[PDB]
Structure formats: structure tokens, C-alpha cells
């Protein structure tokens, strides 16, 4: 029978049969079932002997610190893992029962409680976010470092599916072609919830976060360090949701970490959602002189050819910035940012194109100077602004297609134009007139310089209106105007110079300019003949 049994049954060992995880690992052939809670010590390392194993978790890994998995064969899968700290730390909860953010340091300190979730452990970044909290926090709530972390070290082709936990963290160190798939809402600890760190060895490649969601955590939900997906854009975040990150939803690191670069290139960031981060929704900048990366002489600060594939992202409720990045030659599309306390978008980009961007009700707490900022020479095609609550400062950018109830005096761009519209109709509702206004921002950002109006004569249903063409004078909009059909008179009312017109008032040849001659109660006309010569004629008399 043994011979037969050996050939007809699925191989799997279970943790309940062993004293340590290494013992179970050594006995494993195909499957490994975690069927009993396992308390690990920080630094506990398991060697899987290069075996391609399928690890099924039906119990918890309990401990503060890291449980290190090494030498898993390409193709290994870990499903249902649950990490939980042994320590219950002090956490702050900077929001109200009505989901309003608390910004006052004293109010935030008052939320202190010991819990493994529904809040996070304060870090130094909180000292910046809630000014004065550093001196108000009790000493036992400062400098905590609790995280139950599953660290996968220097493995290739390992996938972690449906992972969860309390004060949990997942770290892929020196890994390639690894994936965090369908994270089952783990509640984060002190460190990043999902981190792909490749500071040593080759640049990380093939590393992804696919689907799923995370909640809380003291810093960023997803973090990448020194990853390059190559031209194939093999890596990134797709279909993910981050809720209430203590720092940002998704972050690509910037600057030097250790003695090398922590920057990232050629990754995808698509079809993802970030809601209520304490700092930013997406922090995709690379610069904060670049050991291990492009020298500043090749690419100036904020002008690295990051080349990320960015599309279809939604951000809501950030206490910081909704969408942030830097880089040169980028194409960004279909971004929707709503209800953020700081800038909806903070873009330190140059020679980049943004298509179909919607920034709706951001910088609601005036944390920044504007709702959307762009530093370099960029192109914006399709920009929706204003929901129900400067708006845009992009000094060197050319923009087309803004929609929304924007206050024109709060727009600053290099050039704004609608070059390809067809025949136009201006439809006016709730007013006695329709209007097409012109505003030269160089002259004034607050006053329209001229207009074409249509005004009702009489009342509704009169079938009569008068058209008026206006110009500003003495900083008084519409000070001077020509009217057609005022009071249904069917004639044109023409403005004349109130005094003797000077020779220089007339512009073109074969034109005449009426002027008043008060001493004779006469209208005169300064005429510039077809030949360019001036002559003054009598136009109308008593």
C-alpha cells in the first residue's frame, strides 16, 4: 500500500507536527500548511532549500519584528498569511466621528489609545504635519517601532496572495518578479505596509502590487526603492486601494538612501485609488549629486526621464497633496482628485503632457498656494476645476480645455487657447443678458477689458434684445460702448469723443472718428482719407 499511497496522494506537511517553522520547511515537498499560530522571534530566518512550495496559511504568525523567508524556489506561493504584533502600541487617530480631519496638535494628542488598529503610531513626520505635537505627546507614545513583518529575502518569482494582519508589514528585500496580490486589507504597523526594496544587487524588476487594499500604517502603504521595470514597464501598482496611510498611498522614493540611489524608473501606476492619506495620494517624485544614478550634469534636479506609465488614478480626502511627481518627458492621463486639504496636484515636471485631469475642490485648508502647481514647460489638455467649494499656477505651461466655475483672476498659465472650436452658441440662464467677455491678463487679471452682450428689451417674451460691444476705460469695465437695437429702436447708438479729438486718436486710413465740438453744439469728424492724410469735417449741426 505504501508504494501506492506514495503515488496517489498530494504531499503536504503541517506546522502542527513540528516544533519550529524551519523543521516544517525542511520536511516540505510540495505543500506546507500553517495550521497553528506560530510565535516567532525577531530575525527568525527560514531556509526553504530552493523548493517550489505552496504555502497555505490558516493561522497567524505572531511577533514584533521580522520573520525572514529565504531560498523559496521560483514559482512559490504564499496564501492567506496573517501577521500580528505581540505588542499593542499607542496610536493616534487624527479624524472625527464625522470623518473630519483634526489638524490641531492638542486635539490629536487627545485621541491617544492602545490598539493594534484604527489609528497609527506617531512618527517624526507627524511632528511636521501637526505642529507642536512633538512637545505634547507623552513619552510612551513617542518613538514606537512596532511592526510584525514578513520579509521575503532575495527570492525570485514568489507571490504573496490574500495577505492580512494587524500592525502588519510585508517586505520584499532584493527580490525580482515578485507580486503582492489581492492584499486582504492588512492594518499597517510602523513601517511601510508593502515595500519593494532593491538597494543591493540589481535594480528591482517584475515587482508588482496587483489588486487588494491596505488600511492605516504609520508611513506609506506601498513603497518602491531602486526599481526599474525597463522599457517593458515590468512592475508597479495596478488595481490597488490604499486607505488612511499615515504618510502616502503610493510612494517611489527620492534621493540617496545609504550610499546609493533609492529612485525608480519605468513602472506602471494604473487603475488605483487612494483615500484619506495623512500626507499624499501618490508621491511619484524621484528628486528631493546622485550616487548610483544619473548625474545632475546629465539631468538637472526634477528632470529625470522617469518614464512611468500613469493612467486612471483616483484620489480623495488627502490631508496633504492628492497627486505629486517630478520628471521630464512624462505623459500622464486620466487623473481625478477630489476633496483634498492641500494641493490637488503638485507637479515639478518639465516637457511633460497631462491629458484629461480633474482637480475638484482641493487646497480646502489653504495648506498650499494653489490647487494645481506646474513648474516647468508643460502641456495640459483637458482640465476640470472647481466642485462645490491661485487655483492654477503653471507659469510656463500651455493649457487648453478648462471646464468649471473657476474664478479667472486665479488662473496663471503661459498660454490658454481653444484653437479648434466650431460654430459657437453662448446660452444664458437666469439672467437678463448673455455675454461673451474678453480679459487681457497683462492689463488686468480682475477686470474684463471688453465684451459682446445681448440684453433683453422690455421683458421675457418680448422678442426683442439689444446687442452691445464694449471697452474698458479708467479701469471701469464696459465704460464705452456701441449698441444695436436698444429699446427696440432698430438703430445703432454710436459713442463719440467727448472733446476735440487729437490727430493720433484715429488708427486706420479710410476711417472717420466722430468728436464733440462743444462751442458750436456740433459733431465733427476726424477723417483719415484713403491716402492717409487727415482732414476735419463737420458731421452734424443744429
UniProtKB/Swiss-Prot annotation:
Entry's Gene Ontology BP terms: adhesion receptor-mediated virion attachment to host cell; symbiont entry into host; symbiont entry into host cell via disruption of host cell envelope; symbiont entry into host cell via disruption of host cell envelope lipopolysaccharide; virion attachment to host cell
Result, substituting residue 283 to N: Complete loss of hydrolysis of O-antigen oligosaccharides
EC number in record: 3.2.1.-
Predominant place of localization: virion
Quaternary structure note: Homotrimer. Interacts with the host O-antigen lipopolysaccharides; this interaction induces cleavage of host O-antigen. Interacts with tail hub protein gp10; this interaction anchors 6 fibers onto the tail hub hexamer.
Domain notes: The interdigitation of the polypeptide chains at the C-termini is important to protrimer formation in the folding pathway and to thermostability of the mature protein.
The name this protein goes by in its record: Tail spike protein
Origin species: Salmonella phage P22
Origin organism lineage: Viruses, Duplodnaviria, Heunggongvirae, Uroviricota, Caudoviricetes
Covered residues, full protein: 114 to 667 of 667
Amino acid at each position: 500500500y505504501s508504494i501506492e499511497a506514495d503515488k496517489k496522494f498530494k504531499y503536504s506537511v503541517k506546522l502542527s507536527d513540528y516544533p519550529t517553522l524551519q523543521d516544517a520547511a525542511s520536511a516540505a515537498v510540495d505543500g506546507l500548511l500553517i495550521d497553528r499560530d506560530y510565535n516567532f522571534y525577531g530575525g527568525e530566518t527560514v531556509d526553504f532549500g530552493g523548493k517550489v512550495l505552496t504555502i497555505e496559511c490558516k493561522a497567524k504568525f505572531i511577533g514584533d519584528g521580522n520573520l525572514i523567508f529565504t531560498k523559496l524556489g521560483k514559482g512559490s506561493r504564499i496564501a492567506g498569511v496573517f501577521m500580528e504584533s505581540t505588542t499593542t502600541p499607542w496610536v493616534i487617530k487624527p479624524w472625527t466621528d464625522d470623518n473630519q480631519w483634526l489638524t490641531d496638535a492638542a486635539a490629536v494628542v487627545a485621541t491617544l489609545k492602545q490598539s493594534k488598529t484604527d489609528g497609527y503610531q506617531p512618527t517624526v513626520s507627524d511632528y511636521v504635519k501637526f505642529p507642536g505635537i512633538e512637545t505634547l505627546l507623552p513619552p510612551n507614545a513617542k518613538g514606537q517601532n512596532i511592526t510584525s513583518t514578513l520579509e521575503i529575502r532575495e527570492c525570485i518569482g514568489v507571490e504573496v496572495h490574500r495577505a492580512s494582519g494587524l500592525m502588519a508589514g510585508f517586505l520584499f528585500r532584493g527580490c525580482h518578479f515578485c507580486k503582492m496580490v489581492d492584499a486582504n486589507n492588512p492594518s499597517g504597523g510602523k513601517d511601510g505596509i508593502i515595500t519593494f526594496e532593491n538597494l543591493s544587487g540589481d535594480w528591482g524588476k517584475g515587482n508588482y502590487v496587483i489588486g487588494g487594499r491596505t488600511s492605516y500604517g504609520s508611513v506609506s502603504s506601498v513603497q518602491f526603492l531602486r526599481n526599474n521595470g525597463g522599457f517593458e514597464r515590468d512592475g508597479g501598482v495596478i488595481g490597488f486601494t490604499s486607505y488612511r496611510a499615515g504618510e502616502s498611498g503610493v510612494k517611489t522614493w527620492q534621493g540617496t538612501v545609504g550610499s546609493t540611489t533609492s529612485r525608480n524608473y519605468n513602472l506602471q501606476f494604473r487603475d488605483s485609488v487612494v483615500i484619506y492619506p495623512v500626507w499624499d495620494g501618490f508621491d511619484l517624485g524621484a528628486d528631493t549629486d546622485r550616487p548610483g544614478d544619473y548625474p545632475i550634469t546629465q539631468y538637472p534636479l526634477h528632470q529625470l526621464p522617469l518614464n512611468h506609465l500613469i493612467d486612471n488614478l483616483l484620489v480623495r480626502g488627502a490631508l496633504g497633496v492628492g497627486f505629486g511627481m517630478d520628471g521630464k518627458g512624462m505623459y500622464v492621463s486620466n487623473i481625478t482628485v477630489e476633496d483634498c486639504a492641500g494641493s490637488g496636484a503638485y507637479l515639478l515636471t518639465h516637457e511633460s503632457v497631462f491629458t484629461n485631469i480633474a482637480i475638484i475642490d482641493t487646497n480646502t485648508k489653504d495648506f498650499q498656494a494653489n490647487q494645481i502647481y506646474i513648474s516647468g514647460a508643460c502641456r495640459v489638455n483637458g482640465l476640470r476645476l472647481i466642485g462645490i467649494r491661485l487655483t492654477i499656477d503653471a507659469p510656463n505651461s500651455t493649457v487648453s480645455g478648462i471646464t468649471g466655475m473657476v474664478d479667472p483672476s486665479r488662473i496663471n498659465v503661459a498660454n490658454l487657447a481653444e484653437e479648434g472650436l466650431g460654430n459657437i452658441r453662448a446660452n444664458s440662464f437666469g439672467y437678463d443678458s448673455a455675454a461673451i467677455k474678453l480679459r487681457i491678463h497683462k492689463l488686468s487679471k480682475t477686470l474684463d477689458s471688453g465684451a459682446l452682450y445681448s440684453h433683453i428689451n422690455g421683458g421675457a417674451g418680448s422678442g426683442s434684445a439689444y446687442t452691445q460691444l464694449t471697452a474698458i476705460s479708467g479701469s471701469t469695465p464696459d465704460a464705452v460702448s456701441l449698441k444695436v437695437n436698444h429699446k427696440d429702436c432698430r438703430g445703432a447708438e454710436i459713442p463719440f469723443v467727448p472733446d476735440i479729438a487729437s490727430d493720433d486718436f484715429i488708427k486706420d486710413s479710410s476711417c472717420f472718428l466722430p468728436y464733440w465740438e462743444n462751442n458750436s453744439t456740433s459733431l465733427k469728424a476726424l477723417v483719415k482719407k484713403p491716402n492717409g492724410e487727415l482732414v476735419r469735417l463737420t458731421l452734424a449741426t443744429l
